[PDB]
Structure 1
Amino acid sequence: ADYQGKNVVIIGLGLTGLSCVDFFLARGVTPRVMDTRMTPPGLDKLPEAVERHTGSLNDEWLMAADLIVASPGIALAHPSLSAAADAGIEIVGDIELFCREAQAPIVAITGSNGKSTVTTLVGEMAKAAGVNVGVGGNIGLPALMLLDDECELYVLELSSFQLETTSSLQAVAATILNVTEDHMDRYPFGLQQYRAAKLRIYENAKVCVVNADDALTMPIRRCVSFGVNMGDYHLNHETWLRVKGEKVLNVKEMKLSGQHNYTNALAALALADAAGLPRASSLKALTTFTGLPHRFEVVLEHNGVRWINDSKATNVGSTEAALNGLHVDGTLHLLLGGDGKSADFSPLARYLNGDNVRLYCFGRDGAQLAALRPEVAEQTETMEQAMRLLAPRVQPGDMVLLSPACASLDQFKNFEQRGNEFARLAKELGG
């Protein structure tokens, strides 16, 4: 791709938009940037020579563009962006720009839950083999910052939003880990529209890796599969990872636990195998990886109480993965809240029966979450209020679990800030 002389407009003054500004400037193109937010987080990090427009989309700029670069946070269905598409103005995202420049194979990972774990695992498998690997995308390091002529393999976590604006991805190995309701505020044609965006990841992929236990991960119309009791990669119950009936790893050697993390390990191994990484070093990486911050992270274990930061549980399916099979000796104090993105929370209710569960519900959708079981629920405005309410009630044997089933953007800079604030309060209140 050659952008010289083009009128380039970037939508979004967040992490993605700033990475795109740097990308174009380094290639001799001065873009313009807009964002519907009046004071977006990148407003003061923008180079002084770059024109900026905030508080709305600027149709004068969009309709004059040769190329529109849309951050994943702007809907293609926004009327101004849809009008530009109607006029035949090219619209891409940062992942598209990346794919046009990358010169190493790409492993591409999407799904409603498990993405960052699988992405990081494949990266660790590559590192264990001595491969120069770049890991990024939706996990938090903008993909354009990975571009490096010495890179031998890229591992990208991709969201449905990023996939909507991507056309040139030809992954060496691609997966949809699972499909459960999320981002319904962005998908007015519902679950199948969200699924269709994720299904784009398989187009022109050399190997597709599907979840044998989740039919929505399969192309609508020759894929490798992983699953619990079936699949090319599957579990054998002590629990083993197996490939086509052959034991490859006793999961006692992993640091992660839980069935969903064992299938994450299977998916990572299937992708690593498809990318040509040596099996021995891939298996080694499964035994060294300890987990990610904010993903079912024990931030304090003291006086018989475990305080668990699962702030990365931004949808119902992720909270379900925390709750399904969860063992608690005493009472579970569960923190739910934030921006639910129009999700139906009712699938959580089957985990919330019995005498040993208390709900502390906060943020934009706190009332809807407390309605799951009002007789054991309290509602506050903020997470801090919820923590100060529950802490006097905690007894040895209890668990305090932040697994909020919602996005954090109504009250926090990012889910990391939500998790960090939870950890600070847990240390104050629990020690």
Structure 2
Amino acid sequence: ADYQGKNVVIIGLGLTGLSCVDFFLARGVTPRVMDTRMTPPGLDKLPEAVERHTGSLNDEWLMAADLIVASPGIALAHPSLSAAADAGIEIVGDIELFCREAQAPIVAITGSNGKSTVTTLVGEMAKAAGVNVGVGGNIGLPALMLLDDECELYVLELSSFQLETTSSLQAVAATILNVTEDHMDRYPFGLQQYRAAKLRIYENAKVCVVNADDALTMPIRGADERCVSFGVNMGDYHLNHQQGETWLRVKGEKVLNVKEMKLSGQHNYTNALAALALADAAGLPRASSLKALTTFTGLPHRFEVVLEHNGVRWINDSKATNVGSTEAALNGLHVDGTLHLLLGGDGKSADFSPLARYLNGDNVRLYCFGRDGAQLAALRPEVAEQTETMEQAMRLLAPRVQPGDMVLLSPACASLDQFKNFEQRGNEFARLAKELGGH
């Protein structure tokens, strides 16, 4: 598309907004930019020529624009944007700009949880085939930074927020991995409104990879001839457990024993299935995609085995900052002895009731900490202890573990009451696991 001579206004000075600034400058267009923060981080990366307004939105700049490029962090429902829309001003996001320029096929991945794992895994499948693949879309690698005529395949992680402002995506393969009650400040009409944003990913997709276990991932008018499913018990791509072992199964055929993989957890096995389905649909060779499943290490803090010693597996799932992530960790969980489950932090008013279903059984102990520890201990008080900190909780459980046990940090909560971020929480857990369980 051609933006020469247009009055372009960008909202957001995070890395996404900065990537939009670069996009227009590279095309000889000098945009204006605004951010509601007084001192956004990206301010000191801007060139002198770019007019900027911080500390609020600038309504007259919006109402004068030919094109508004909105960060995913502001809602189309914000009054200033609604007023611009009412005036007929075009509002797009970075992904819309990307889709108008992309000259290679796009694999598009959304869902409440699992996006970065599946996106990274599809990217590894492409790399194993020797494809110059561009993987991005998260806040650390905005999609526009990937645009290059040398790129042969794009693999994008897309949020519901980005999909709301995107109309031109034509994915070769698209998935909604799952939909769980989250992000509800932005979706005041509930789960079906959150879903509706994600459902946009299937518009004009050639193949829709759907979750056989989550009906909210089905396209809006239902399953159609484009749909390929993945699931635990059944689907085009599913899991087979027999005689103590587990295999990935595709169209009625085992393709891989999961012992060849480096990932753990049933939900990571279904992530592997979704990735394989997407890669297959994209035209990547099956053999190299399976090879990638055997070499992919997984991402830090995503149900990550940081120590396996003396028959005890210590699992850093610090990125489980919400209930849906921890529920998926507990569902189908394989533990020979006792699960020592670490829950805690700032739960952001979540309903933890869903976790109760998994917390019966004589082989579970809860160790609850942080701001909302008392609420988490209440799930099942007779097997629960409460401490202030994660380290205190780990020192409580360490003398009790036995071969066959699992120590799982899957907090279901944000870390910011006690840590700088979830990476610091997971790194501290890994340090303590080695101190306390390594000998």
Superposition TM-score, scaled by structure 2 size? 0.87
C-alpha change, 1:317 and 1:21, in structure 2 (3 Å) is: same
Following superposition, the deviation at residue 50 of structure 1 comes to: 3.3
Following superposition, the deviation at residue 68 of structure 1 comes to: 1.7
Q: Unpaired runs of 5+ in structure 2?
A: none
Q: Are 2:248 and 2:258, in contact at CA under 8 Å, matched by a contact in 1? A: yes
Aligned residues: 431
Following superposition, the deviation at residue 38 of structure 1 comes to: 3.6
Matched residues in 1 for 2:58 and 2:371: separation? 29
After superposition, what is the alpha-carbon deviation per residue over 1:299-347, rounded to whole angstroms, capped at 9, x for unaligned?
Answer: 3456765442212213222111222343556764544345545532210
Following superposition, the deviation at residue 100 of structure 1 comes to: 1.1
Q: Are 1:114 and 1:177, in contact at CA under 8 Å, matched by a contact in 2? A: yes
Matched residues in 2 for 1:229 and 1:132: separation? 34
Q: Which moved more, 1:31-40 or 1:380-389?
A: 380-389
After superposition, what is the alpha-carbon deviation per residue over 1:210-237, rounded to whole angstroms, capped at 9, x for unaligned?
Answer: 1122111111214112223322222333
Q: Are 1:210 and 1:226, in contact at CA under 8 Å, matched by a contact in 2? A: yes
- Aligned counterpart in structure 2 of residue 334 of structure 1, from 318, 335, 341: 341
Instruction: Tell me what 2:38 maps to.
Output: 38
Q: Are 1:108 and 1:171, in contact at CA under 8 Å, matched by a contact in 2? A: yes
Q: Are 1:184 and 1:341, in contact at CA under 8 Å, matched by a contact in 2? A: no
Following superposition, the deviation at residue 184 of structure 1 comes to: 1.4
- RMSD of the alignment, in Å? 3.0
Q: Are 2:265 and 2:303, in contact at CA under 8 Å, matched by a contact in 1? A: no
Q: Are 2:170 and 2:206, in contact at CA under 8 Å, matched by a contact in 1? A: yes
Matched residues in 1 for 2:416 and 2:4: separation? 36
Following superposition, the deviation at residue 105 of structure 1 comes to: 0.2
Q: Which moved more, 1:372-381 or 1:136-145?
A: 372-381
After superposition, what is the alpha-carbon deviation per residue over 1:246-299, rounded to whole angstroms, capped at 9, x for unaligned?
Answer: 232222222223322222222111111111111111111111112111111123
Matched residues in 2 for 1:408 and 1:51: separation? 36
Q: Are 1:119 and 1:157, in contact at CA under 8 Å, matched by a contact in 2? A: yes
C-alpha change, 1:337 and 1:216, in structure 2 (3 Å) is: same
Q: Which moved more, 1:202-211 or 1:340-349?
A: 340-349
Q: Which moved more, 1:324-333 or 1:379-388?
A: 379-388
Following superposition, the deviation at residue 208 of structure 1 comes to: 0.9
Q: Are 1:333 and 1:358, in contact at CA under 8 Å, matched by a contact in 2? A: yes
Following superposition, the deviation at residue 16 of structure 1 comes to: 1.4
Following superposition, the deviation at residue 389 of structure 1 comes to: 7.5
Instruction: Tell me what 1:23 maps to.
Output: 23
C-alpha change, 1:90 and 1:408, in structure 2 (3 Å) is: farther
Matched residues in 2 for 1:355 and 1:259: separation? 22
Give the secondary structure class of the aligned counterpart of 2:357: helix
Q: Are 1:185 and 1:341, in contact at CA under 8 Å, matched by a contact in 2? A: no
After superposition, what is the alpha-carbon deviation per residue over 1:154-176, rounded to whole angstroms, capped at 9, x for unaligned?
Answer: 01111111111111100000011
C-alpha change, 1:314 and 1:139, in structure 2 (3 Å) is: farther
Matched residues in 1 for 2:386 and 2:30: separation? 49
Following superposition, the deviation at residue 360 of structure 1 comes to: 4.9
C-alpha change, 1:36 and 1:392, in structure 2 (3 Å) is: farther
C-alpha change, 1:207 and 1:46, in structure 2 (3 Å) is: same
After superposition, what is the alpha-carbon deviation per residue over 1:345-376, rounded to whole angstroms, capped at 9, x for unaligned?
Answer: 21012223456655455566555444434565
C-alpha change, 1:30 and 1:127, in structure 2 (3 Å) is: same
C-alpha change, 1:111 and 1:26, in structure 2 (3 Å) is: same
Following superposition, the deviation at residue 138 of structure 1 comes to: 2.4
C-alpha change, 1:224 and 1:304, in structure 2 (3 Å) is: closer
Give the secondary structure class of the aligned counterpart of 1:351: coil
After superposition, what is the alpha-carbon deviation per residue over 1:78-97, rounded to whole angstroms, capped at 9, x for unaligned?
Answer: 22222222222221111111
After superposition, what is the alpha-carbon deviation per residue over 1:12-59, rounded to whole angstroms, capped at 9, x for unaligned?
Answer: 222212222222222222223323334434344444443333333222
Q: Which moved more, 1:257-266 or 1:409-418?
A: 409-418
Q: Are 2:6 and 2:66, in contact at CA under 8 Å, matched by a contact in 1? A: yes
Q: Which moved more, 1:101-110 or 1:414-423?
A: 414-423
Following superposition, the deviation at residue 204 of structure 1 comes to: 0.2
Matched residues in 1 for 2:47 and 2:227: separation? 45
